């Protein structure tokens, strides 16, 4: 693993740690202090090194969890919840649905869609991010 | 305005470019949420924060020029609006006992990382001082 210096370098060689929308930066913008689940998901969704397990579908703010277990694992590591899993993550996403932030796409599993006005908050359009991230639509 | 402008504007002020990001350091240590010592290392490696916190040029020694400001940013980062240096100082005693941070004897608001921070971070003190254009005191 080496030192932190090596850690940053090793991950840079793998094209990691370059998200378009960093969760910590977004948390500072919204004033939430610690990062929240929706900010974490936007970071993963704008980090090309994460497309193997989470990605945009190409339809607006819709995204899918190709590997829900890996998303839950990374969330647990990010928040020091070693027992984090999809079941708890799903319950969390259910709370976001009540506040009309994230909705589930019927007919497809592990597919969700940001329903709030994300374009006005972030200053990015859905298609703009898709182009940057080389999103291949489903 | 928007988040994009928020990133732009702050970038023009050379903000948000710390050598040791706290969240990145937390990922390296596996701590999950950032901890106070990581938060301090971010500020200490953020050129835009040198007005209220900076190194002294002597190894891992650093000083809090505006101890009230560093506490405000710590409270805003952990949703503690009533955070003040009086409370923040209480939390620093934990790092005293664990021989992570020590107060410089005979100097107030001056501390030093007494752990092998070079082996952890991979940086020497002089290296970060040069990158940060620190003026020794």
């Amino acid at each position: 693993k080496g030192t932190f210096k090596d850690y940053v370098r090793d991950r840079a060689d793998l094209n990691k740690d370059k998200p378009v929308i960093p969760a910590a930066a977004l948390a500072g913008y919204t004033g939430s202090g610690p990062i929240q689940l929706w900010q974490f998901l936007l970071e993963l969704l704008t980090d090309k090194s994460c497309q193997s397990f989470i990605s945009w579908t190409g339809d607006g703010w819709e995204f899918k969890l190709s590997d829900p277990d890996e998303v839950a694992r990374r969330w647990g590591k990010r928040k020091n919840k070693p027992k984090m899993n999809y079941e708890k993550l799903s319950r969390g996403l259910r709370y976001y649905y009540d506040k009309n932030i994230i909705h589930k796409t019927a007919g497809k599993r592990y597919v969700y869609r940001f329903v709030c006005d994300l374009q006005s908050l972030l200053g990015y359009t859905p298609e703009e991010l898709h182009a940057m991230l080389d999103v291949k639509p489903d | 305005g928007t988040f994009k402008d928020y990133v732009r504007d702050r970038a023009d002020l050379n903000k948000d470019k710390p050598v040791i990001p706290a969240a990145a350091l937390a990922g390296y240590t596996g701590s999950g949420p950032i901890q106070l010592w990581q938060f301090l290392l971010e500020l200490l490696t953020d050129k835009s924060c040198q007005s209220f916190i900076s190194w002294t040029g002597d190894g891992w020694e650093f000083k809090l020029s505006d101890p009230d400001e560093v506490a405000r940013r710590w409270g805003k980062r952990k949703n503690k609006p009533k955070m003040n240096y009086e409370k923040l100082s209480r939390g620093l005693r934990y790092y005293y006992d664990k021989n992570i941070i020590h107060k410089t004897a005979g100097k107030r608001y001056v501390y030093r990382f007494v752990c092998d921070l070079q082996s952890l971070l991979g940086y020497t003190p002089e290296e970060l001082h040069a990158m940060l254009d620190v003026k020794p005191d």
């Binding site: 919204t30 939430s32 610690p34 929240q36 689940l37 929706w38 928040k79 020091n80 919840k81 708890k88 319950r91 969390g92 709370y95 976001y96 506040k99 932030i101 709030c116 006005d117 908050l121 | 999950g32 949420p33 901890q35 952990k78 949703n79």
Partner: peptide, 16 residues
């Protein structure tokens, strides 16, 4: 939009 706290006994928010 507003992002009110997400803190429940079945889904507790982390802090420290």
């Amino acid at each position: 939009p507003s992002f009110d706290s997400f803190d429940f006994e079945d889904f507790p928010a982390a802090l420290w």
